[PDB]
Design a protein around this motif. Structure first.
Motif, PDB file in Angstrom:
ATOM      1  N   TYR B  85       1.029  -1.182  -0.153  1.00  0.00           N
ATOM      2  CA  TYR B  85      -0.044   0.044   0.031  1.00  0.00           C
ATOM      3  C   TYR B  85       0.857   1.097   0.083  1.00  0.00           C
ATOM      4  N   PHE B  86       2.303   1.127   0.226  1.00  0.00           N
ATOM      5  CA  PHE B  86       3.203   2.270   0.306  1.00  0.00           C
ATOM      6  C   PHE B  86       3.894   2.442  -0.920  1.00  0.00           C
ATOM      7  N   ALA B  87       4.311   1.185  -1.491  1.00  0.00           N
ATOM      8  CA  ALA B  87       5.293   1.354  -2.249  1.00  0.00           C
ATOM      9  C   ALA B  87       5.029   1.920  -3.401  1.00  0.00           C
ATOM     10  N   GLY B  88       5.917   2.668  -4.291  1.00  0.00           N
ATOM     11  CA  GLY B  88       5.532   3.172  -5.486  1.00  0.00           C
ATOM     12  C   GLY B  88       4.585   4.245  -5.413  1.00  0.00           C
ATOM     13  N   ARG B  89       4.444   5.063  -4.274  1.00  0.00           N
ATOM     14  CA  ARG B  89       3.182   5.724  -4.343  1.00  0.00           C
ATOM     15  C   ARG B  89       4.043   7.121  -3.872  1.00  0.00           C
ATOM     16  N   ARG B  90       3.185   8.350  -4.519  1.00  0.00           N
ATOM     17  CA  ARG B  90       3.882   9.710  -3.907  1.00  0.00           C
ATOM     18  C   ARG B  90       2.879  10.042  -2.604  1.00  0.00           C
ATOM     19  N   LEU B  91       3.242  10.960  -1.701  1.00  0.00           N
ATOM     20  CA  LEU B  91       2.549  11.176  -0.703  1.00  0.00           C
ATOM     21  C   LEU B  91       1.344  11.269  -0.914  1.00  0.00           C
ATOM     22  N   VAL B  92       1.136  12.170  -2.069  1.00  0.00           N
ATOM     23  CA  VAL B  92      -0.317  12.850  -2.275  1.00  0.00           C
ATOM     24  C   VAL B  92      -1.420  11.873  -2.840  1.00  0.00           C
ATOM     25  N   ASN B  93      -0.438  10.528  -3.733  1.00  0.00           N
ATOM     26  CA  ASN B  93      -1.192   9.534  -3.905  1.00  0.00           C
ATOM     27  C   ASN B  93      -1.687   8.669  -2.686  1.00  0.00           C
ATOM     28  N   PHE B  94      -0.714   8.624  -1.890  1.00  0.00           N
ATOM     29  CA  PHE B  94      -0.888   7.618  -0.776  1.00  0.00           C
ATOM     30  C   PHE B  94      -2.103   8.314   0.082  1.00  0.00           C
ATOM     31  N   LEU B  95      -2.323   9.607   0.365  1.00  0.00           N
ATOM     32  CA  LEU B  95      -3.265  10.293   1.229  1.00  0.00           C
ATOM     33  C   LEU B  95      -4.870  10.176   0.145  1.00  0.00           C
ATOM     34  N   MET B  96      -4.630  10.437  -0.901  1.00  0.00           N
ATOM     35  CA  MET B  96      -6.076  10.227  -1.647  1.00  0.00           C
ATOM     36  C   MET B  96      -6.365   9.140  -1.815  1.00  0.00           C
ATOM     37  N   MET B  97      -5.493   8.029  -1.905  1.00  0.00           N
ATOM     38  CA  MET B  97      -5.961   6.513  -2.102  1.00  0.00           C
ATOM     39  C   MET B  97      -6.483   5.945  -0.583  1.00  0.00           C
ATOM     40  N   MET B  98      -6.247   6.893   0.521  1.00  0.00           N
ATOM     41  CA  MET B  98      -6.396   6.205   1.734  1.00  0.00           C
ATOM     42  C   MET B  98      -7.792   5.738   2.063  1.00  0.00           C
ATOM     43  N   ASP B  99      -8.838   6.464   1.517  1.00  0.00           N
ATOM     44  CA  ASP B  99     -10.135   6.001   1.730  1.00  0.00           C
ATOM     45  C   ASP B  99     -10.395   4.820   1.000  1.00  0.00           C
ATOM     46  N   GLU B 100     -10.036   4.088   0.064  1.00  0.00           N
ATOM     47  CA  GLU B 100     -10.081   2.964  -0.738  1.00  0.00           C
ATOM     48  C   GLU B 100      -9.321   2.039  -0.068  1.00  0.00           C
ATOM     49  N   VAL B 101      -8.124   2.238   0.373  1.00  0.00           N
ATOM     50  CA  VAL B 101      -7.349   1.355   1.247  1.00  0.00           C
ATOM     51  C   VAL B 101      -8.040   0.799   2.380  1.00  0.00           C
ATOM     52  N   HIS B 102      -8.479   1.890   3.141  1.00  0.00           N
ATOM     53  CA  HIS B 102      -9.336   1.649   4.302  1.00  0.00           C
ATOM     54  C   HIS B 102     -10.508   0.774   3.999  1.00  0.00           C
ATOM     55  N   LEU B 103     -11.045   1.059   2.974  1.00  0.00           N
ATOM     56  CA  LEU B 103     -12.346   0.047   2.512  1.00  0.00           C
ATOM     57  C   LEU B 103     -11.883  -1.433   2.152  1.00  0.00           C
ATOM     58  N   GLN B 104     -10.707  -1.533   1.406  1.00  0.00           N
ATOM     59  CA  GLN B 104     -10.195  -3.047   1.279  1.00  0.00           C
ATOM     60  C   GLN B 104      -9.759  -3.506   2.549  1.00  0.00           C
ATOM     61  N   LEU B 105      -9.242  -2.729   3.630  1.00  0.00           N
ATOM     62  CA  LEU B 105      -8.982  -3.332   4.749  1.00  0.00           C
ATOM     63  C   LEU B 105     -10.117  -4.002   5.536  1.00  0.00           C
ATOM     64  N   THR B 106     -11.409  -3.530   5.285  1.00  0.00           N
ATOM     65  CA  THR B 106     -12.491  -3.934   5.929  1.00  0.00           C
ATOM     66  C   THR B 106     -12.910  -5.342   5.357  1.00  0.00           C
ATOM     67  N   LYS B 107     -12.523  -5.363   4.323  1.00  0.00           N
ATOM     68  CA  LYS B 107     -12.700  -6.741   3.768  1.00  0.00           C
ATOM     69  C   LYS B 107     -11.587  -7.768   4.043  1.00  0.00           C
ATOM     70  N   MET B 108     -10.455  -7.319   4.836  1.00  0.00           N
ATOM     71  CA  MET B 108      -9.786  -8.188   5.319  1.00  0.00           C
ATOM     72  C   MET B 108      -9.591  -8.431   6.880  1.00  0.00           C
ATOM     73  N   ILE B 109      -9.896  -7.403   7.465  1.00  0.00           N
ATOM     74  CA  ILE B 109      -9.941  -7.391   8.774  1.00  0.00           C
ATOM     75  C   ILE B 109     -11.432  -7.374   9.392  1.00  0.00           C
TER      76      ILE B 109
END
Ligand code: HEM
Ligand code: HEM
Ligand code: HEM
Lengths: 187, 185, 186
Positions: B85-109
């Motif tokens: 989730y961190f690799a190859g991202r710009r910070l601004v990418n990381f932050l803007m993507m964070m809502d979708e990552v949190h969603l995918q995490l709800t499917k794993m935890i």
């Protein structure tokens, strides 16, 4: 089953057990040994079943043992098809992400129906992963996990904790233990 | 809260303020100081709130400042859990993507309910990020942002522009300015 | 169209044909030549059409070849916006993943409406990709594909199979041939 995977199964059998073990099994279901299969065509699952049975007969191996070995091989092949599903992952990431990966694959390979694979962290150093399908390919499921361990070079122990067929679905749950914590806090 | 993140908080509090402080704080709410917590068990939020209060009482550090620091530290930990989730991202990418990552995490935890994070490109070199939650962990949110900045090695300026408990939801909006354009040509 | 993308195009037109052609084309539709375009403001599509029209009239270039050039140029820019969408993928991966990527962009860029891009691996070494949009930007589509080919350093052959507009939707289907198999064994 989609031609994509089947074409790959055939070729993997060829590497494993040789060409005219595979040639003759293919003839057994009425295919020419050099039959070309397209990625999106639909292959009758029962034909695949009959092909693998013949290889077993001819090799002296039980078919379940063959599915396992084929599962082991396929991880490398999948990693070549879609390296970005593998890149930068821990093994446990890869396994926990797999249900979501199979879902995206269905949007890219029309008509594909890979099994559900819900995985859950059950302990500090283990997950349980449950295979759920209309197709019952328990051994392939296990081989792919083993092949995943080899790809990521993370040793695991895998134990079946549950098996069953309910309302048209085959189910298989395994407990997978790792050498390091799933969510390690370190210094 | 899920044990996954709570187990991490405890260990982070131990590194920061010591074992005896955390043990006693755990005891003050009726837990074994060495409670074994599994990734998926449900930990009462109010007990966590009380653990953190007692730690603040004993260290003299304001609890807000404690959350902010735990947030700074936890980014590193998350990157060890899910490096891809961190690799190859710009910070601004990381932050803007964070809502979708949190969603995918709800499917794993199963049962995890991380806050909503609406992020928006608001200007050429700035975004807005709005934290929306039933839990009001403002400082923790601000710490994770700060931790991300250090991890990606991109300096940012962050100004809070909005704070309030609109619905049953607490909301906090920040303006985040980068040294680079969001969509650079 | 979202300002994020229109601003990029303006910048690309300036790179290609110069500030004078672009300045006059912006004035032609009632914009200040140095008007600031924000990433999230909504730009009228028909204004963009007239701007590109005026650039065509002033440069002598066919507007279709302009969109094609701009599409070729833009792939590199997109990779600066979101390098993790390009990172570690094969070209065929990139193209088959684009529809899900365009869908996730709508979640990060409010109001953005990129075209639907259904891709199908139709043969051992080629896919079909169908462009479908309420808009009709056939040449931009094709340039972006060519631009992808250049970025990933993998040669393709592209063949048009079908194009058409029905009840307000434009569609364009191409066949894209690679030098290597899509699902290679060993
Ligand atoms: C990126 C890696 C992988 C890819 C691309 C992949 C792809 C596929 C595809 C295309 C199918 C065909 C479905 C159909 O023809 O309808 C399939 C089936 C299957 N997949 Fe995956 N797979 C991957 C990893 C895994 C892993 C790690 C497992 C671990 C359990 C797994 C389990 C299975 C099983 C057991 C089937 C057999 C069909 C059935 O059980 O109904 N796959 N896979
Ligand atoms: C890959 C990086 C991250 C991971 C793996 C992650 C994971 C988690 C997890 C597991 C929880 C527990 C939810 C629960 O128990 O229900 C959580 C909650 C939370 N997440 Fe994330 N997170 C990450 C990055 C971020 C970032 C960048 C932010 C903010 C900008 C953030 C904000 C929060 C906050 C403030 C909480 C708890 C507070 C609340 O409920 O409001 N996380 N996150
Ligand atoms: C990661 C790379 C890409 C990004 C970030 C991206 C992003 C976008 C964005 C933001 C828009 C504007 C939507 C709006 O303002 O409503 C857009 C439009 C468009 N994109 Fe993509 N895109 C990418 C790759 C591609 C690729 C590979 C193609 C292949 C053809 C493509 C084809 C198009 C077309 C044809 C349009 C607008 C025209 C229409 O409606 O027909 N894009 N894209």
């Amino acid at each position: 089953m989609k031609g994509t995977i089947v074409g790959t199964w055939i070729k993997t059998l060829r590497d494993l057990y040789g060409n005219d073990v595979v040639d003759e099994s293919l003839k057994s279901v009425g295919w020419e040994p050099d039959r070309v299969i397209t990625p999106l065509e639909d292959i009758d699952d029962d034909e695949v079943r009959r092909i693998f049975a013949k290889v077993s007969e001819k090799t002296g191996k039980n078919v379940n043992e063959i599915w396992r070995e084929v599962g082991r091989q396929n991880i490398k092949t999948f990693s070549e098809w879609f390296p970005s599903y593998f890149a930068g992952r821990r093994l446990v990431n890869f396994l926990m992400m797999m249900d979501e990966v199979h879902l995206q694959l269905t949007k890219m390979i029309k008509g594909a129906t890979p099994p559900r694979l819900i995985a859950k962290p059950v302990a500090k150093d283990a997950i349980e992963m449950e295979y759920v399908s209309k197709r019952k390919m328990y051994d392939y499921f296990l081989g792919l996990i083993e092949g995943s361990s080899k790809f990521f070079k993370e040793e695991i122990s895998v134990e079946e904790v549950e098996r069953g067929e309910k309302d048209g679905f085959s189910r298989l749950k395994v407990r997978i233990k790792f050498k390091n914590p799933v969510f390690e806090y370190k210094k």
